[PDB]
Amino acid sequence: VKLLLLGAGESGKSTIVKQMKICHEAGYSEEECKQYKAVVYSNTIQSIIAIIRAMGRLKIDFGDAARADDARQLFVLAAELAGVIKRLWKDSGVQACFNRSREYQLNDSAAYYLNDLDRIAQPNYIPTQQDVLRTRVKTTGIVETHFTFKDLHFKMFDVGGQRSERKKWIHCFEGVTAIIFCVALSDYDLVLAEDEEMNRMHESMKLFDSICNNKWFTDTSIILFLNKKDLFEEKIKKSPLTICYPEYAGSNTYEEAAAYIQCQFEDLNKRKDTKEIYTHFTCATDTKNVCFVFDAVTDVIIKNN
Numbered sequence: 001v002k003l004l005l006l007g008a009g010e011s012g013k014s015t016i017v018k019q020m021k022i023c024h025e026a027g028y029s030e031e032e033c034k035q036y037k038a039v040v041y042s043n044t045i046q047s048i049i050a051i052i053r054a055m056g057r058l059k060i061d062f063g064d065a066a067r068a069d070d071a072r073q074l075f076v077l078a079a080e081l082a083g084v085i086k087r088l089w090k091d092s093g094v095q096a097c098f099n100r101s102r103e104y105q106l107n108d109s110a111a112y113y114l115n116d117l118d119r120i121a122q123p124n125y126i127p128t129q130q131d132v133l134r135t136r137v138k139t140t141g142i143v144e145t146h147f148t149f150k151d152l153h154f155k156m157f158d159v160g161g162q163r164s165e166r167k168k169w170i171h172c173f174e175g176v177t178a179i180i181f182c183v184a185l186s187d188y189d190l191v192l193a194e195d196e197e198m199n200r201m202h203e204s205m206k207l208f209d210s211i212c213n214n215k216w217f218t219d220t221s222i223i224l225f226l227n228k229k230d231l232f233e234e235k236i237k238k239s240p241l242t243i244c245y246p247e248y249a250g251s252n253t254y255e256e257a258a259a260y261i262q263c264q265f266e267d268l269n270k271r272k273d274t275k276e277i278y279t280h281f282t283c284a285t286d287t288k289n290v291c292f293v294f295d296a297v298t299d300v301i302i303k304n305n
């Protein structure tokens, strides 16, 4: 079996791969985690530094004037760093800005790491499976991973999903059993990182429409993962799906919006009466899910194949 993990930038592709090693292989060894210790430490800082650079751009102020020394020592250091980062994370000014995160770029896992700060900052800190799932590394190029399942030799190819990487795709097309197209549900109200005047989700719909109907997959199963449902569930509550879809006349319910974004995506499907779209909703950082949905994923291919 040959699967292709296609999607836009930060849609969750790489986080779905990590989940394959956890459901089908023994989930990350204590040293295999320690290897991501530096990346965690790195995501955390970049996360906090992003907020502080954001406040000054949006002209937001702190809550206490003691954030000068903290945010200043934070840039100089670039172990008191922990406390320094801690104090910052609390401050009303910081938090107030963290909400308007949509207006700029912030690591999805930012809240995660900074909330588990004390644990993460302990000398003998050995990152957990989840900590490794949460990490952020821009994928550049093509990463291959082979593994077995219900007897099939799976060869999963995970590529970078960005305007600059989307060209390296054509060579991993011919032999391809099925592909998983990951969509970040929470991208409805954000804009591209390569173009500021491009709704992150419309970009995904352009890509999906392109892949979904590309002739090289007339017989390749198309799986749609509407990833980041957990972040989507927290964002419609304070943001209108109208920002992405002006025609959207339904309610601001995680359930209705989600059943619009879905329909939106599947309607782009040509080869319509001769091809089905297997849509799911996922939370890539939740092993329970990724395997429950993947369990169905393998099953559908077993039917179709």
Ligand SMILES: Nc1nc2c(ncn2[C@@H]2O[C@H](COP(=O)(O)OP(=O)(O)O)[C@@H](O)[C@H]2O)c(=O)[nH]1
Residues within 6 Å of the ligand: 007, 008, 009, 010, 011, 012, 013, 014, 015, 016, 108, 109, 133, 134, 135, 136, 137, 138, 139, 161, 182, 227, 228, 229, 230, 231, 282, 283, 284, 285
């Ligand atoms: N909260 C949450 N974060 C996610 C989810 N899927 C991925 N992420 C995080 O989003 C970031 C980007 O995902 P990644 O898989 O590296 O991107 P891709 O490889 O470009 O598709 C990583 O830091 C992930 O931990 C999800 O369903 N929920």
Ligand code: ALF
Residues within 6 Å of the ligand: 007, 008, 009, 010, 011, 013, 014, 137, 138, 139, 140, 159, 160, 161, 162
């Ligand atoms: F943004 Al990517 F893999 F598509 F890190």
Ligand SMILES: [Mg+2]
Residues within 6 Å of the ligand: 013, 014, 137, 138, 139, 140, 158, 159, 160, 161
């Ligand atoms: Mg990647």
